[PDB]
Each structure stands twice: as structure tokens, then as C-alpha cells.
């Protein structure tokens, strides 16, 4: 059942009672993103196995 | 079997232009972060190349 995603990181710390959408991914390293997202992007989301 | 165990510490592990390298195969480690290294000093770290 992956239909239920977690994030991975984010920039910014907590916050209570706010929900974020967003699905960009920052330069962490390795391959830290194209441009600013496309291919070689670890998507901030993972699913549940 | 028999890696090393130099004691590689107490200097600097500076990465500036390192990072900027593409042809540096990886430096940026998550044990602490990849940006706490330049003036971050090791307290008996230990190599095993």
C-alpha cells in the first residue's frame, strides 16, 4: 500500500498546524537536482511498502 | 579485512573549491553535515581507506 507518502526533508524545520504540498527538491549532493527539478531529482516523497 | 585506522583529526577539512570539482568523485558526508567540515575538527576520527 504506497499510496501513502512521507517527506523526505525540509528546508525548513517544523511547523504546528500547517500542511505543505510542495514537491521540489534541493541540492543536497551526489546528484542533487537538474536545473531546478527534472532527472537525477530524489523526490522529497516516499511511499509506504 | 585489515582497513586502516590512521587518526586523520584536529586539522581542516576544507572542501570550497573541492565541492565545485566535478571531476571529485564525493566528499559531502550526512554524518554531521555536508557543509560542517571546513572549520569543523575531528575528535579522533579514524581513516579506513
Do not use: H, M
Request: aromatic fraction near 20%; charge should be positive; include cysteine.
Amino acid at each position: 500500500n504506497y499510496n501513502y507518502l512521507y517527506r523526505l526533508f525540509r528546508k525548513s524545520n517544523l511547523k504546528p498546524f500547517e500542511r505543505d504540498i510542495s514537491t521540489e527538491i534541493y541540492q543536497a549532493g551526489s546528484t542533487p537536482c537538474n536545473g531546478v527539478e527534472g532527472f537525477n531529482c530524489y523526490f522529497p516523497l516516499q511511499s509506504y511498502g | 579485512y585489515a582497513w586502516n585506522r590512521k587518526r586523520i583529526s584536529n586539522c581542516v577539512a576544507d572542501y570550497s573549491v573541492l565541492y565545485n570539482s566535478a571531476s571529485f568523485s564525493t566528499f559531502k558526508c550526512y554524518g554531521v553535515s555536508p557543509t560542517k567540515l571546513n572549520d569543523l575538527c575531528f575528535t579522533n576520527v579514524y581513516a579506513d581507506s
